[PDB]
Amino acid sequence: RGSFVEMVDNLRGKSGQGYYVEMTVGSPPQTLNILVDTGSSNFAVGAAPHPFLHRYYQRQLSSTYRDLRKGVYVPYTQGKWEGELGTDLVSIPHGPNVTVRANIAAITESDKFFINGSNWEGILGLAYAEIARPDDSLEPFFDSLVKQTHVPNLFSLQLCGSVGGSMIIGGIDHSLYTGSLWYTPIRREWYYEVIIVRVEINGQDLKMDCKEYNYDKSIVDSGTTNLRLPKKVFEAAVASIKAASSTEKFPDGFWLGEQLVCWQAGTTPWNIFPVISLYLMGEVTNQSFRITILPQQYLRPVEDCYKFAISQSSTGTVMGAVIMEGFYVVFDRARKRIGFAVSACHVHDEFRTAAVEGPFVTLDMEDCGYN
Ligand SMILES: C[C@]1(c2cc(NC(=O)c3ccc(C#N)cn3)ccc2F)N=C(N)O[C@@H](C(F)(F)F)[C@@H]1F
Ligand code: NA
Ligand code: NA
């Protein structure tokens, strides 16, 4: 408990391609790099020689593979995968010293799913059964780990924005953050859904009915890059960010992520750009706390050309790698709560850093959830 040196620095990534962990499947073990995704619930790995893949799961080499004789077809807004379900032995070499029989979707066909040039071959969905495909009877990886071993029911993520970071399975590592953790209730176990109770742009309230902030949900999602905001909130949010920064001008397409913006090396003026404050529902009645991110988080370098990484959504708020990279994030499934602390690795400057503070008094926080 509190100290897990074998797990520190067990994630890798390339900017905008996500964070992955090394895993092994089958006997003998086949090593695969696997995207860490708290916004889905399937363990799904490349199982056929798609040209984008460095490696793929070869069921025929595994003596412990068991076929479930059942297909799965999974579309998303862009792209899709189809695969064959079964189970096999899975370990995490730089995770707990255990092996579990987990469900695995062996991906046999995909479209716009794998990234050309990336170093990962599958996805580890860490969310709950309610959104597993085909349905909630396909037990997700984390559920199997907890049922079959003594690994405690929690994990935590430190994403460092050549990306790296730490996934601590079964605990928290105190060297990964500073100050205190503050917890927000997981409103329902499907996605890691939470409730945003107030939003401030450089300490000015957007002043919306807070139901707008969670229309139709807000979730914590390591498998998305952007901070995504419901359209109505996104519109209010950039209007207020535009106003805060208008001491300089950007093309308008910029704010829709339709073009990039550039300054010449080491000239980016961060001091014009405002901080963005999200207040999350706290653990106690009428109590919230707030997390504060920097322009360093919402202006992503494209390899000095940044992309605006907040974007409108029709699926609700998505706190992607934009948010998580400032924070150490504890997915405390045993107590149905998500903890945030300042990350000991976040990208910052001389004037400002990311922040997690409380308590604040916020009344009627239950009105903020969408039904
Ligand atoms: C399974 C799924 C998903 C995630 C990624 N994710 C990255 O490719 C990436 C890229 C960069 C970063 C970063 N930083 C993280 N992930 C790619 C394909 C996917 F199919 N997971 C989530 N959460 O979002 C859904 C969606 F992508 F469709 F929106 C989708 F359900
Ligand atoms: Na257990
Ligand atoms: Na600490």
Curated annotation (Swiss-Prot):
Q: How is its activity regulated?
A: Inhibited by RTN3 and RTN4.
Question: Which sites carry carbohydrate?
Answer: 97, 116, 286
* Stretches assigned to the Extracellular side: 1-371
Write down the membrane topology: Single-pass type I membrane protein
Q: Which cysteines are joined by disulfide bonds?
A: 160-345, 210-368, 262-305
Q: Which residues does the UniProt record annotate as the domain Peptidase A1?
A: 19-341
**Record-listed E.C. numbers:** 3.4.23.46
The places in or outside the cell where this protein is found are: Cell membrane; Golgi apparatus, trans-Golgi network; Endoplasmic reticulum; Endosome
Q: How does it assemble?
A: Monomer. Interacts with RTN1; RTN2; RTN3 and RTN4; the interaction leads to inhibition of amyloid precursor protein processing. Interacts with SNX6. Interacts with PCSK9. Interacts with NAT8 and NAT8B. Interacts with BIN1. Interacts (via extracellular domain) with ADAM10 (via extracellular domain). Interacts with SORL1; this interaction may affect binding with APP and hence reduce APP cleavage. Interacts with NRDC AND NRG1.
Protein name stated in the entry: Beta-secretase 1
Q: What is the lineage of its organism?
A: Eukaryota, Metazoa, Chordata, Craniata, Vertebrata
